[PDB]
């Protein structure tokens, strides 16, 4: 029910130079817009991007994209599946730039691949203004995994872009799902250490980060802005953070692969404690004590609860807060210390 549109500006491309695009389901009565950034890791040199092109080509190219996609979770148009924003205009932006949505570089005689993630978002926003976004009251930029980090890197640029295009009434907000990572010590050492790979990626991609964060960390240190707890305080747009306390991707880059003995037990408990600590001053957040990865486009996303409140409810309470609320909380972080100490955790 979401229909493919390739970008009219065909200079804004996926990795291999094919045009980027978006899937759109309009809702005629609605002034709410949901733009969702797909995730799927990244690549950061010629050799690992070549490998990704062999076996993950849909993440690098639009050549084989289907004409439609079915919206699931927060992208579902059915109230039964999506209590939050079922009647919104929905946009799914495929991740085909392998750059955590940060890149601003074209394929050229010096570049085998194009890394245009940041420009893809800008161009989607620009072309949507002629399809009804000009009349929007709220634009929620959402995303899972690398797309969740992409929200953090791009939400304020979308707000700046709309302001400079003459649309200061559109309220831009962010929803970052499973994109809030820690640059912590690995349980065992190896690469991968995400700090080093992101450092190399930014140079390979011509990656860009939000301006205030860039000005804090300065040249050569912009990799810091890919880490939510560092970039979030620099952002002006309201951002709701969704993060499993024991995220599978975090554990993977930490070289944890699950009878747990004391060293690993303490490692996992300390990871949950550190994640919880970084969310202490994030007023809008949903952080269940589960070992999982992504939530908001999963069909059963309504099932998990923190302190008896589901994520669709928390997001609705967030909406109300942006118009504390009795019985409508927006800060929901588990305090129990082990995966699945919350009984509503996904089953697998
Ligand atoms: C999956 C995925 O997309 N991941 C995992 C770790 C990560 C991602 C994306 C951006 C940044 C990071 C890092 F560097 F913060 F760990
Ligand atoms: C196409 O996109 C590029 C890169 O974002 C930009 O420089 C150029 O002005 C755009 N052209 C049109 C016609 O939108």
Swiss-Prot record:
Record carries keyword Transcription = no
Q: Which residues form the active site?
A: 145 (charge relay system), 247 (charge relay system), 293 (charge relay system)
This enzyme catalyses: [Wnt protein]-O-(9Z)-hexadecenoyl-L-serine + H2O = [Wnt protein]-L-serine + (9Z)-hexadecenoate + H(+)
The glycosylation sites annotated in the UniProt record are 9
Its subcellular locations are: Secreted
Which keywords fit this entry according to its UniProt record? Glycoprotein, Hydrolase, Phosphoprotein, Secreted, Serine esterase, Signal, Wnt signaling pathway
Which EC number applies? Answer: 3.1.1.98
Q: Keyword check for Cytoplasm, yes or no.
A: no
**Which signals induce this protein?**
Up-regulated in hepatocellular carcinoma (HCC) with high intracellular beta-catenin.
Annotated GO biological processes are:
bone development; negative regulation of canonical Wnt signaling pathway; negative regulation of Wnt signaling pathway; protein depalmitoleylation; regulation of bone mineralization; Wnt signaling pathway
The record's top EC class is hydrolase
Instruction: Specify the effect of residue 145 to A.
Output: Abolishes enzyme activity. Unable to mediate serine depalmitoleoylation of WNT proteins
**Gene Ontology CC terms:** endoplasmic reticulum lumen; extracellular region
- Single Gene Ontology MF annotation: protein-containing complex destabilizing activity
Q: In which tissues is it expressed?
A: Rarely expressed in adult normal tissues.
Q: What family does the entry list? A: Belongs to the pectinacetylesterase family. Notum subfamily.
According to its UniProt entry, the function of this protein is described as:
Carboxylesterase that acts as a key negative regulator of the Wnt signaling pathway by specifically mediating depalmitoleoylation of WNT proteins. Serine palmitoleoylation of WNT proteins is required for efficient binding to frizzled receptors.
Recorded protein name is Palmitoleoyl-protein carboxylesterase NOTUM
Its organism's taxonomic lineage begins at: Eukaryota, Metazoa, Chordata, Craniata, Vertebrata
Gene behind this protein? NOTUM
């Amino acid at each position: 029910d979401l229909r493919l549109h390739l970008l009219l500006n065909t200079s804004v491309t996926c990795n291999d130079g094919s045009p980027a695009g978006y899937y759109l389901k309009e809702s005629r009565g609605s002034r709410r817009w949901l733009l969702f950034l797909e995730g799927g890791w990244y690549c950061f040199n010629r050799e690992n991007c070549d490998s990704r092109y062999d076996t993950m080509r849909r993440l690098m190219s639009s050549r084989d994209w289907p004409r439609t996609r079915t919206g699931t979770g927060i992208l579902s148009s059915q109230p039964e599946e999506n209590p939050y924003w079922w009647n919104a205009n929905m946009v799914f932006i495929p991740y085909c730039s392998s750059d955590v949505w940060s890149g601003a570089s074209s394929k050229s005689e010096k570049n085998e691949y194009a890394f245009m993630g940041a420009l893809i978002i800008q161009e989607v926003v620009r072309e949507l203004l002629g399809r009804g976004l000009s009349g929007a009251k709220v634009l929620l930029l959402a995303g899972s995994s690398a797309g969740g980090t992409g929200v953090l890197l791009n939400v304020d640029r979308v707000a700046e872009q709309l302001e400079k295009l003459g649309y200061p009434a559109i309220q831009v907000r962010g929803l970052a799902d499973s994109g809030w990572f820690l640059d912590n010590k690995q349980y065992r050492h190896t690469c991968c250490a995400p700090t080093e790979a992101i450092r190399r990626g930014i140079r390979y991609w011509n990656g860009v980060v939000p301006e205030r964060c860039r000005r804090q960390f300065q040249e050569g240190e912009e990799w810091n802005c890919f880490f939510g707890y560092k970039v979030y305080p620099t952002l002006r747009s309201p951002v709701f953070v969704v993060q499993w306390l024991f995220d599978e991707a975090q554990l993977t880059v930490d070289n944890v692969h699950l009878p747990v003995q004391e060293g690993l037990r303490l490692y996992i408990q300390n990871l949950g404690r550190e994640l919880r600590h970084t969310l202490k001053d994030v007023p809008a957040s949903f952080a269940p004590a589960c070992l999982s990865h992504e939530i908001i486009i999963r069909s059963h996303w309504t099932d998990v609860q923190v302190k008896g409140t589901s994520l669709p409810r928390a997001l609705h309470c967030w909406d109300r807060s942006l118009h504390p609320l009795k019985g409508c909380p927006v800060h929901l972080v588990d305090s129990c210390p082990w995966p699945h100490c919350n009984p509503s955790c996904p089953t697998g």
